[PDB]
């Protein structure tokens, strides 16, 4: 139990968690864009000039 | 003068060869000169809504 100094280290090595990339990457799931406005069906002519 | 239709609250007619002046002072006259009869003065004794 001396506990002399021991030589300088050779490299490091550094263990740490990767993150899974399976899932992106993918195509891009955007928002789906809303509809532009349609004009209605059945619109009818429903004012009649008098007489 | 031609009569398209008439029933109880409605009238549609013509008028034949006549100015726009006049048609104009009949519209105007039933517009804002026949008189009628309404509620002028209301005497409340209680209004409780």
């Known amino acids: 139990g001396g506990l002399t100094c021991a030589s300088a280290p050779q490299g490091t090595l550094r263990i740490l968690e990767g993150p899974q990339q399976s899932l992106s990457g ?3 799931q955007p928002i789906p ?4 406005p349609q ?3 059945g619109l009818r002519p429903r004012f009649c000039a008098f007489g | 003068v031609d009569v398209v239709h008439m029933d109880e609250n409605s ?9 726009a002046a006049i048609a ?11 008189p009628t009869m309404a509620v002028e003065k209301v005497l409340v004794y209680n ?3």
Do not use: W
């Open chain 1, 39 to 41: 004009i209605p069906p």
């Open chain 1, 26 to 28: 993918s195509p891009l």
């Open chain 1, 33 to 36: 864009a809303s509809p532009p």
């Open chain 2, 47 to 49: 209004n409780t809504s």
């Open chain 2, 11 to 19: 009238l549609e007619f013509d008028m034949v060869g006549i100015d």
């Open chain 2, 24 to 34: 104009n002072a009949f519209r105007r006259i039933l517009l804002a000169e026949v």
